[PDB]
Write a protein that binds this DNA or RNA. Structure first.
Ligand code: SF4
Lengths: 261, 1138, 261, 261
DNA sequence: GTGAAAAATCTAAAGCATCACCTT
DNA sequence: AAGGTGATGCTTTAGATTTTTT
C-alpha cells in the first residue's frame, strides 16, 4: 500500500493546481525513491515532469513501482476543497481502482477523507537523459509571474535570450513588441529575491508563450525557479518544491527550418 | 342543432341548387355524368324519416348539369371480445329504438393481430344509423366512456375499441361504392321505390370543360391601415367565366369612364374583359349577383380570399339590405372557411402552400405567378393605390384584372388538372384535397387501398404524455435521428479548375477484380438486357482496365475534376419498396413468438438498426412524482373568463400537461442548469415480411404507375409536337387534353409517393410507427456513408444531404460507356460507370434475400426473391459547386449549396438566405449577384478575385452611406419583412424584436392592427438609444408614411432624444450593424472558404474570426511548429491497470 | 401611518441580499409586533419566514395591519444604495401603494429617498407547525458556506448525516466523491467559531446543493447558523439577525421513494 | 524626441481605466506645460478634458507641439500589466511611428521596455468659453460614485435641482423615481469629507444617467469631486488632483422642448 | 411538411481578474 | 505594510425560442 503523509499541504494543492492547466491527463507513478510523473500534454508540444522525493515527507510507505493514469482537472477541483494549512495524506491500495485523500485541518478537529476512481488511457512514455545546459538563471517566482502576465498581452511567441548583459524576454505581436532586460545581482543580502546567472555561450532561442502561462501557475509554490536552456534542446523550467523535490516544465522550441535560404 | 333547422337548411339548399341549374332527376331514365362535387345533405326518403344522403353534382359535354341524391346509411365498426359478439348486438338492438338503421357483422383482417396468417379474421360489429346528426349523437354518447376504459387498460362494458370514428361520412360513401371525382358515370334513375344506380364508364376519358368563376377585388382603404369591414366599400370587382372576363366598377370613386379592353401576357392566356360602370355599390352588388345567377357556376376561384375577400364582402353585403346566405350561398363554417352549399370553393393559395414545392418566400401574387405561370404581373402598392386611382384608375383596372387572370389561369393550367388528377384516386371532393394537408389525403388513399384489402383501419393515435424512456427523464421531445447531412469541405469546385487528388491504390486494386462484375450487373439488372445480345463486351472490359491502370500507377495527381450528384430520385420510396417494411408489421419478439410461424431457421424476421434521439428533463421519477402529487387540490384560473375556481383532478389533459411542463421548466432551472439533455442511442427493429402488403405494394403500384404514365406522357408529347406541326385543331385539342391528363396523373402519383414517408410519423395519423421513419432514414444514412467512404477512398466527397452524395472524381475516371446490342427494342444502350459500381456495392451489402411474396393464398405458398431498386442515378457533369463555411469553431454550413448546370445557368440553389423569409433585401440581391458573377476566372485565385471585385461593391455602398445612390430605393433596401405566427397575447411573456415592433404598432395604431394572424411585421434598428438590446430599437417602417408631426412625437417618445434636430433616414440608421450583417454574410459565403483553401484574403474589408487569422499567420511564420516526440528520443510504451 | 428608523443599516440590507434570487414575490404583513414575511417560491419546495420585531427598531409606530404585495427582487436592487452604518428609514401611508426609503447618514448630512410600488397578488399563506427537531446544530456561517461552495463543484446531491459524533457531508457525482466530518468542540472559549450539536436519534438525509448555495448568500449577516432536521421534516435554516430578528429557510428534502426494490 | 519620467504610476494608470470604456480612441496633446487631452465621446455626446501639468510630474523633455493618435484600449492593456509603485518613462519620436514605455522598479532590478505602434486619427477640437457657473458643489468621491452607481438602478436619466438648501439628485424610471438630498456641514476639519453648496441662483437641469455611471471610473484617482453647472449649460465634473493634474467632464444636457404645449 | 439545420437574438450561469479589507 | 481572501463586476459561451428551408 502507498501512503504519503505531509504536514503543510498548500504545496501539494498548488503543485497540482499548476498541473491541471498545462495537461489534461497525467501518469502517477510510485516507487521507493519517490513519486514520478513523466506524462506529456495532449498537443504533444510540451512536457511536465515531477520528482517528489520520499525523504521530504513526514511519512512515506510504498511497496513497489506502480503507474496509474489519473486525470488532473478532477483531482485539482476536488483538492481545491482543502484549506491552505491542511495535512495531506495520499492513500492507494495494491490493486484497487480508487485512491483516497485525507485532509486534516489546522484546528485538529476537522477530518476530510475523499476518494476518486481511476480510468485507463494510452500515453507515450519518455525518458530524459542528462545534457549540459549552457545558460542557467535563478529567477524569483513572483518576478517570473509578472513576466508571463506581462509578455502575453503582446503576442504568443517569446524570445528567451541569454547574453553577457543578462537575460532578455521579448515578444512580438499585432500591437508591436516588448523587450524586458534583466541583470544579475551583486550586493543584495538576500537570496530568495535575487537573480543569479551562469553561462557558457550566448543563447538565442524562442518558445511558445501560451505554455509559459500554463506553466507559471506554480508561482506561490516556492519563491525560486531555475530557467535552463542550451542550443536545440527543450527549455527547462525547474520549479523546486521545498525539501520535497522538483518539477521540470519541458518546452519544446519550434525550431526554425531552412526554407527560404 | 334542431331538426327543424336541418330541414329548413335542406329545403333551402334544394331550392338554391335548383336556381343554380342543378335540377334533380325525378323521372326514370338513363343519364351520363361527370362528377365534380360531393356534398353531405339531408334528404327526406319515401318513408318520411329523417335521413342523410350525398348530393353528387354531374356536368355533361354540352353544358347541361344535374344533381343526384344518393342515400347510404352512415356506419362504423365496433370491436368486441371473442365469444361476446352477438350479445353486444342484442343489447344494442334494445337501447336505440328508432335510432339504428341496422347492425351486422363484417369480418375483416387486422394489422397488429398475432398469428394473423393462420386463417383467422377478427369479426367486428358494424353499426349503421340514418343521419349524420344522430351519428354525432351516438359517438358523443359512447366513444369517450369506453375510450377512457381502453386508455386506462351491463353488456356495454365488453366493447373494447370504437374503430373508424373520425372518418367523414361522404368520404366513406366515396370509398364504399367507388365513386371518385372526375370520372365518367352512367346513372340510372329507376324511381323513388329504389335507390338510384350509378356505374363507372371507363371507356370514355376525355375531360369536359366545366363552368368556373374566378374573382378578385380591390378595396378602398384609409392610409396606413388595412381596409375594414364596417366603413369601407368594395372599390371594384373583376371575375372570369371560362376565359371570358367581366369587370364591375363603381363611379363615385373612379375618375373617368373606362371602356372594354383586353390584357394578354402571352398567347397561352387570353384576357378579354368587358367593363361595366355603375354609380353606387347597390348596382355593383346586384349586377354581380344576377350575373352569378344567369351564368350558374360550379367552382369558385379566389386567391387568398378565404380569410380576406369573402368575410369582407359578406360583412359589406349583410348591412346593405342583403344576405350572402340568401343570394349566393357563402358563409362561415366550423373550420373558419367559406364552403358553398352548391359550389366548390378553390383557394389557389393552398396549392402553392402544399403541392408547389416552393418555400414560403413565394406565396404572394407576384412570386407565385412568376414561379409557375412564367410571367411577371404588374406591381402595385396597397397604400397609394386609392390615390393613384383617383388621378387615373386605368392602372388600378390593370392590377385588378391581373389578379383575376393570374388566379384563373393558375387554376386552369396547374391547380385544376393536378387536383382533378389527385381525386381520381383519393376519395375526397375537390374542396378537401386542396384544403387538407398531404397527410390526410394520403390517409384517405390508403383508406381506399386498405378497404380494397378488407382490413379494418387504425384509429388516429392518442398523443402520449409524461414520456418515460429508461428512468424518469420526462421527454420534452422524442425523435428519430434523421438523415446525416454534412458538408465535408467548403469553397469552389469548378469543372476546369485543377484539384489535388490523393488516391488509395488498394481501392483501385479492388476495382481491378470487379470491372467484369460491375459491367455484368450494369446490364443484367438496370436495362434488363442479357449479355448474349451484345458483342462489345471485350472492348469496354479492356478499355476500363487500361484507363484504371493508367490511373493506378499515379495515385496522386493534379487535374480537373468531374462533379456528380450521385443520388436516388426518390430514395425514401425506394427503400420502403425494397425492404418490404410495413408500418403495420414492425413487431417485437413476443408477438413473433405468439405466431405459429416461428420455425427454426426462419426468414420472416428481418433485422435493422436505427438511431433514437431524446431531449428530456434532468429530473428523476421521484422529482416528477413530487410535483404531480403536490399539484392535487389547488385552485387554477378557468379557461372561461369570470369563472369559478377549478381544481386539478378535473382538468383536461392539454392544460395539465402544459402546467406540468411549465412547473418543471423552472423547478430544474435552478437545480441542474439545463432543461433537456440530448441523448442519442441505438435501437434494433425486427420486421415481419408476411404482413398485409397494403403499403409497400401500394408504393410499388404508384411507382410503376408513375413510370407507365411518364412513358405515355413522353409518347403523347411527341404526338403533340407532331400534331402542332400538322395543324388540325380537333386532334391537337384531344392530344393536348390527353397529355395534360397523363402529366397531371403522374405528377399527382409522385406527389403521393414523396409523402408516403412524411405521413407515418404525423401526430394524429392512423399508421403511426416511429420505427418506420427511424429505420428507413438510418438505412438512407448508412448507404450514403458507404458511398461517402468509397468516394473518400477514390476521390473527394463534397456534400451529403440525405438524398445522395455530391462528388468530385478524377477526369480520367471511367464515366460512361455505350453498347451496341442486336436487340430490336434496344439497338444501343448507354450507361454510366460510377452509378454502376454504386449499384453493385449496394447489391453486395443491401440485398434483401428474405424479400418475401405470396404465390398461393389457399395453400400458404411463400416465395423468397431478390430485388433491389435502390439505384444511384447520376446527374452528369455539372459545372460548379459552391459550399459556404461557418464562423463557429470547427463546424461549417450544412444543407445549403449552389450548383450550376453545363451551359452556365443556375441548376439549384438550396438552403441559402437569398430566398428565405425574415431576411433583409440587402443580403439577397448581393447573393444573387455574387453567384452569377462567381463562375468567371482562370485559376483558383482568379475566381476569388473576380468575385471580390463584385462583393466589395456592397461595401463601397455602405461605407459611402449611399450618397449618390438615391434614397427612393433605400427604404426597401433595409426593411425587415418577417411574419408572425400567433397573436401577441398568445405569446404572453415572450419577448423578441417582432413582438416589440408589434407592440410599438399597438401603441401607435389601434389594437385591430395585431388582432389578425399572419401580420407582416416591419422594423429597423436605430442608433441613438444605445446600450439597450436591439429589442427596444425596433422602430416600424409604418411611421415614415404617417403625418410628419406624428412621426416627430412618436420618434421622441420611442428613441428618447429630445435634443435631436435632424430626422433624415440616412443618419438615424446605424450603418455599423448593417455592415456587420453584410460582413457576417460575406464571411459565411466567401471569406472563410477562401481562407480554408490556402488562398490570400480576397476582400480585406472584413476581419476573420480569431481562430482563423492566428492559424493563418502561424502557417505563414518563419519558425515552424516543432513537437517533442520527433524532436527528442523516446523511451517506450506502457499501459495502466485498473 | 408607518415611520420607522433603524441605526444599523447592514442588518437590513444583507437580509434582503439573502432574498434577491431565491424568491421574487413578497407579501409583507405588519402589526404591532413588527413586520412579517411568509413567502414560498414557484419551485414549491422552498419557504422563507422573515420576522423583524418592533422593539428591535429604533423608533416604531404603526396604525393598523396592512398587506404589502410587492415583488421582492426589486428592492434588493434598491437597498444596496445605503452604506454599512447608514441609517434606514421606512415611510408608508394608510392605503398608498408607494413606499419611501430614506438613508440618514450617521454624520447627519447625507440623506436620500426612493419610492417603490406594489402589485396585485393572490398568495396562499401556509402554516408552520411547531414540531420537535431530532438534530440541531449551532455552527458558524463561514464554515457552512465553505462546505457548500466546496461540495458544489464535486457533485449536485448531498448526503447529510447528523450522528452523535457530529455530522458528515457527502457529495457524489461524475467528478468523484468526498465526505467531510465535523464533531462537537468542548474546549472552546469564544462562541463565534464554536460548534454544538444536540441529538435525539441519528438523521441521514439527501438534499440539494443549489438550494443550499442560494441559502448561504447571507454569510456576513450572522456568525451563527442553526440547522435543524428530523425524519421527513424540511430543513430549518435559522439566522439570528442581530438580536431583533430571525430568518428561517424551510427546505423540503428530496426524499427518494423506493422504486428500484 | 519626447521623454516623460513619472514616479507615481497610478495617476496615469487609473486614468486609462477611466477612459477605455468611455472613449475608444482619441488624439493626445503634449506641451512643455504637461499633457492636455480633449477627447470626444464615441457616441458623440460628451467631452473629456485632462490637464496634467508639467511640474506635477517628475520630469518632462519635449521639443515642440506633438499630437499622438494613440488608441486607448491597447495602451490600456499595456499599462494593465504594470506595477502601482512602478516608475514609468514615456518615450516618443518626432517622425517614427512608435511609442516606448519603460517600467522600472524601486528595487532597481526590475526594468522592462515596450513599443506600441500608432495610427493617424482626425479629431476636431472645440473651445469651450469660460463662464461663471451658478452652482458649484463639493462632495467626496466615494459617496458621489456610490450615489450614481446605485441610483442608476432606478431609471435612465437624472434631474439635478439646486437651491440654497441643497442639491436634489432625482432620477425617474420604470420601477419609480428617487431623489437625493444634501445638507450642510460646519464642524468638519478634514477637507475631503466637507460638503458645501455654492449658490448664485436655483438651477434646474437634466442629464444622462448612464453617462454618470461611466463618469465614476476615475474615483480611485481622486478623493473629492466638484459638480458645477449654470443656466442651460453642460454639467462640468472636476476630480481635482494634488497639484499633479486636473479633470473635466462635459455632459451636454438633453433640454426638454415644449412639445406637449 | 416529417427532421436536420440556419440566423438571430436575449439570458442565465460559470469562471476570472481586480479591488477592498484584515491580519500577520 | 503587504499578501491572502472574499465580494463583485466583466467576459464568454451554452442554450431557449422563433421562422424557415428542406
Ligand atoms: S415474422 Fe414470422 S413470427 Fe414474426 S409475426 Fe411475422 S409470421 Fe409471425
Amino acid at each position: 500500500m502507498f501512503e504519503a503523509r505531509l504536514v503543510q499541504g498548500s504545496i501539494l494543492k498548488k503543485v497540482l493546481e499548476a498541473l491541471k492547466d498545462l495537461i489534461n491527463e497525467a501518469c502517477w507513478d510510485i516507487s521507493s525513491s519517490g513519486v514520478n510523473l513523466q506524462s506529456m500534454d495532449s498537443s504533444h508540444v510540451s512536457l511536465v515532469q515531477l520528482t517528489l522525493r520520499s525523504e521530504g515527507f513526514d511519512t512515506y510507505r510504498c511497496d513497489r513501482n506502480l503507474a496509474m493514469g489519473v486525470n488532473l482537472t478532477s483531482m485539482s477541483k476536488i483538492l481545491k476543497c482543502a484549506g491552505n494549512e491542511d495535512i495531506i495524506t495520499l492513500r492507494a491500495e495494491d490493486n484497487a481502482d480508487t485512491l483516497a485523500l485525507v485532509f486534516e485541518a489546522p484546528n485538529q478537529e476537522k477530518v476530510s477523507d475523499y476518494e476518486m476512481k481511476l480510468m485507463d488511457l494510452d500515453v507515450e512514455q519518455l525518458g530524459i537523459p542528462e545534457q549540459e545546459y549552457s545558460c542557467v538563471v535563478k529567477m524569483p517566482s513572483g518576478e517570473f509571474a509578472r513576466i508571463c502576465r506581462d509578455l502575453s498581452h503582446i503576442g504568443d511567441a517569446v524570445v528567451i535570450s541569454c547574453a553577457k548583459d543578462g537575460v532578455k524576454f521579448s515578444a512580438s505581436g499585432e500591437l508591436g513588441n516588448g523587450n524586458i532586460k534583466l541583470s544579475q545581482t551583486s550586493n543584495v543580502d538576500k537570496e530568495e529575491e535575487a537573480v543569479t546567472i551562469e553561462m557558457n555561450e550566448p543563447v538565442q532561442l524562442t518558445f511558445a508563450l501560451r505554455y509559459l502561462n500554463f506553466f507559471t501557475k506554480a508561482t506561490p509554490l516556492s519563491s525560486t525557479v531555475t530557467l535552463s536552456m542550451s542550443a536545440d534542446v527543450p527549455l527547462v523550467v525547474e520549479y523546486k518544491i521545498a525539501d520535497m523535490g522538483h518539477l521540470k516544465y519541458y518546452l519544446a522550441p519550434k525550431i526554425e527550418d531552412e526554407e527560404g535560404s | 342543432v334542431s331538426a327543424l333547422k336541418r330541414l329548413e337548411r335542406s329545403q333551402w339548399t334544394d331550392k338554391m341548387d335548383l336556381r343554380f341549374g342543378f335540377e334533380r332527376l325525378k323521372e326514370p331514365g338513363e343519364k351520363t355524368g361527370w362528377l365534380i362535387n360531393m356534398h353531405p345533405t339531408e334528404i327526406l326518403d319515401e318513408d318520411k324519416r329523417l335521413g342523410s344522403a350525398v348530393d353528387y353534382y354531374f356536368i355533361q359535354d354540352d353544358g347541361s348539369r344535374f344533381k343526384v341524391a344518393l342515400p347510404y346509411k352512415p356506419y362504423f365498426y365496433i370491436a368486441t371480445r371473442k365469444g361476446c359478439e352477438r350479445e353486444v348486438s342484442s343489447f344494442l338492438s334494445k337501447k336505440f329504438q328508432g335510432k339504428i338503421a341496422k347492425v351486422e357483422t363484417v369480418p375483416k383482417e387486422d394489422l397488429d393481430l398475432p398469428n394473423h396468417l393462420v386463417g383467422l379474421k377478427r369479426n367486428y360489429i358494424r353499426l349503421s344509423f340514418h343521419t349524420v346528426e344522430d351519428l354525432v349523437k351516438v359517438r358523443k354518447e359512447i366513444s369517450p366512456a369506453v375510450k377512457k376504459n381502453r386508455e386506462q387498460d351491463d353488456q356495454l362494458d365488453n366493447i373494447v375499441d370504437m374503430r373508424e370514428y373520425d372518418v367523414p361520412y361522404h368520404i366513406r360513401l366515396s370509398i364504399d361504392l367507388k365513386i371518385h371525382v372526375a370520372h365518367w358515370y352512367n346513372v340510372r334513375y329507376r324511381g323513388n321505390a329504389f335507390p338510384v344506380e350509378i356505374t363507372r364508364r371507363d371507356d370514355l376519358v376525355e375531360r369536359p370543360d366545366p363552368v368556373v368563376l374566378a374573382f378578385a377585388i380591390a378595396t378602398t382603404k384609409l392610409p396606413l391601415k388595412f381596409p375594414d369591414a364596417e366603413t369601407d366599400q368594395i372599390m371594384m370587382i373583376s371575375y372570369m367565366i371560362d376565359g371570358q372576363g367581366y369587370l364591375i366598377t363603381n363611379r363615385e370613386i373612379v375618375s373617368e369612364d373606362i371602356e372594354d379592353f383586353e390584357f394578354t401576357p402571352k398567347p397561352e392566356y387570353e384576357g378579354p374583359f368587358c367593363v361595366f360602370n355603375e354609380p353606387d355599390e347597390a348596382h355593383l352588388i346586384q349586377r354581380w349577383f344576377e350575373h352569378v345567377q344567369e351564368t350558374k357556376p360550379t367552382i369558385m376561384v379566389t386567391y387568398n380570399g378565404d380569410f380576406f375577400d369573402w368575410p369582407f364582402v359578406e360583412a359589406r353585403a349583410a348591412v346593405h339590405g342583403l344576405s350572402m346566405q340568401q343570394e349566393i350561398g357563402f358563409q362561415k363554417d366550423s373550420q373558419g372557411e367559406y364552403k358553398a352549399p352548391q359550389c366548390i370553393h378553390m383557394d389557389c393559395l393552398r396549392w402553392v402552400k402544399r403541392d408547389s414545392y416552393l418555400p414560403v418566400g413565394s406565396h404572394n401574387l407576384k412570386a407565385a405567378a412568376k414561379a409557375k405561370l412564367g410571367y411577371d404581373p404588374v406591381e402595385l402598392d396597397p397604400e397609394d393605390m386609392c390615390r393613384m386611382a383617383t388621378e387615373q384608375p386605368q392602372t388600378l383596372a390593370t392590377y385588378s384584372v391581373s389578379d383575376a387572370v393570374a388566379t384563373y389561369y393558375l387554376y386552369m393550367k396547374y391547380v385544376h388538372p393536378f387536383i382533378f388528377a389527385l381525386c381520381t384516386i383519393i376519395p375526397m371532393e375537390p374542396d378537401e384535397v386542396l384544403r387538407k394537408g398531404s397527410g390526410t389525403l394520403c390517409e384517405a388513399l390508403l383508406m381506399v387501398q386498405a378497404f380494397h384489402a378488407n382490413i379494418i383501419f387504425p384509429n388516429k393515435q392518442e398523443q402520449e404524455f409524461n414520456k418515460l424512456t429508461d428512468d424518469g427523464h420526462v421527454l420534452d421531445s422524442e425523435t428519430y435521428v434523421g438523415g446525416h447531412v454534412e458538408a465535408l469541405e467548403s469553397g469552389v469546385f469548378r469543372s476546369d479548375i485543377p484539384c489535388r487528388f490523393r488516391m488509395n491504390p488498394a481501392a483501385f486494386d479492388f476495382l481491378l477484380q470487379r470491372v467484369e462484375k460491375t459491367l455484368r450487373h450494369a446490364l443484367e439488372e438496370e436495362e434488363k438486357v442479357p449479355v448474349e445480345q451484345v458483342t462489345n463486351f471485350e472492348e469496354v472490359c479492356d478499355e476500363i482496365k487500361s484507363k484504371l491502370a493508367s490511373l493506378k500507377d499515379v495515385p496522386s495527381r493534379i487535374e480537373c475534376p468531374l462533379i456528380y450528384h450521385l443520388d436516388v430520385g426518390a430514395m425514401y420510396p425506394n427503400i420502403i419498396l425494397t425492404n418490404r417494411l410495413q408500418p403495420s408489421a414492425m413487431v417485437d419478439e413476443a408477438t413473433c413468438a405468439a405466431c405459429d410461424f416461428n420455425k427454426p431457421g426462419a426468414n420472416c424476421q428481418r433485422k435493422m438498426a436505427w438511431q433514437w434521439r431524446g431531449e428530456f428533463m434532468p429530473a428523476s421519477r421521484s422529482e416528477y412524482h413530487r410535483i404531480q402529487h403536490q399539484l392535487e387540490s389547488e385552485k387554477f384560473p378557468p379557461l372561461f373568463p369570470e369563472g369559478p375556481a377549478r381544481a386539478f383532478h378535473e382538468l383536461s389533459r392539454e392544460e395539465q400537461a402544459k402546467y406540468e411542463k411549465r412547473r418543471l421548466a423552472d423547478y430544474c432551472r435552478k437545480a441542474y442548469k439545463k432543461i433537456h439533455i440530448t441523448k442519442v442511442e441505438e435501437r434494433l427493429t425486427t420486421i415481419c415480411q408476411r404482413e398485409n402488403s397494403f403499403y409497400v405494394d401500394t408504393v410499388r403500384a404508384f411507382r410503376d404507375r408513375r413510370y407507365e404514365f411518364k412513358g405515355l406522357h413522353k409518347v403523347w408529347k411527341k404526338k403533340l409536337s407532331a400534331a402542332v406541326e400538322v395543324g388540325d385543331a380537333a386532334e391537337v385539342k384531344r392530344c393536348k387534353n390527353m397529355e395534360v391528363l397523363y402529366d397531371s396523373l403522374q405528377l399527382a402519383h409522385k406527389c403521393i409517393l414523396n409523402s408516403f414517408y412524411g405521413y407515418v410519423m404525423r401526430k394524429g395519423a392512423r399508421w403511426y410507427s416511429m420505427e418506420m421513419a427511424g429505420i428507413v432514414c438510418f438505412t438512407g444514412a448508412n448507404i450514403i456513408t458507404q458511398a461517402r467512404e468509397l468516394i473518400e477512398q477514390i476521390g473527394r466527397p463534397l456534400e451529403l444531404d440525405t438524398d445522395g452524395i455530391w462528388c468530385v472524381l478524377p477526369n480520367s475516371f471511367p464515366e460512361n460507356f455505350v453498347f451496341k446490342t442486336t436487340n430490336v427494342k434496344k439497338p444501343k444502350v448507354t450507361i454510366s460507370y460510377p452509378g454502376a459500381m454504386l449499384n453493385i456495392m449496394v447489391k453486395e451489402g443491401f440485398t434483401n434475400d428474405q424479400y418475401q411474396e405470396l404465390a398461393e393464398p389457399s395453400s400458404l405458398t411463400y416465395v423468397t426473391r431478390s430485388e433491389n431498386s435502390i439505384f444511384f442515378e447520376v446527374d452528369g457533369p455539372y459545372l460548379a459547386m459552391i459550399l459556404p463555411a461557418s464562423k463557429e469553431e470547427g463546424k461549417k454550413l450544412k444543407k445549403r449549396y449552389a450548383v450550376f448546370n453545363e451551359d452556365g445557368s443556375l441548376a439549384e440553389l438550396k438552403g441559402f438566405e437569398v430566398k428565405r423569409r425574415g431576411e433583409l433585401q440587402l443580403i439577397k440581391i448581393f447573393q444573387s449577384s455574387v453567384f452569377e458573377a462567381f463562375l468567371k476566372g482562370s485559376t483558383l485565385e482568379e475566381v476569388y478575385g473576380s468575385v471580390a471585385k463584385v462583393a466589395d461593391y456592397w461595401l463601397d455602398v455602405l461605407y459611402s452611406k449611399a450618397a449618390n445612390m438615391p434614397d427612393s430605393e433605400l427604404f426597401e433596401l433595409i426593411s425587415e419583412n418577417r411574419s408572425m405566427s400567433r397573436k401577441l397575447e398568445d405569446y404572453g411573456e415572450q419577448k423578441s424584436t417582432s413582438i416589440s415592433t408589434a407592440k410599438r404598432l399597438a401603441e401607435f395604431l389601434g389594437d385591430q392592427m395585431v388582432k389578425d394572424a399572419g401580420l407582416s411585421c416591419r422594423y429597423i434598428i436605430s442608433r441613438k438609444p444605445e446600450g439597450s438590446p436591439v429589442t427596444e430599437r425596433a422602430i416600424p417602417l409604418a411611421i415614415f408614411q404617417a403625418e410628419p408631426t406624428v412621426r416627430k412625437h412618436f420618434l421622441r417618445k420611442w428613441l428618447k432624444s429630445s435634443s435631436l434636430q435632424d430626422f433624415d433616414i440616412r443618419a438615424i440608421l446605424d450603418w455599423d450593424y448593417y455592415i456587420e450583417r453584410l460582413g457576417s454574410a460575406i464571411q459565411k459565403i466567401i471569406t472563410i472558404p477562401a481562407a480554408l483553401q490556402q488562398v490570400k484574403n480576397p476582400v480585406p474589408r472584413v476581419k476573420h474570426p480569431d481562430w482563423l487569422h492566428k492559424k493563418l499567420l502561424e502557417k505563414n511564420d518563419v519558425y515552424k511548429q516543432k513537437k517533442i516526440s520527433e524532436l527528442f528520443t523516446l523511451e517506450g510504451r506502457r499501459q495502466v491497470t485498473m
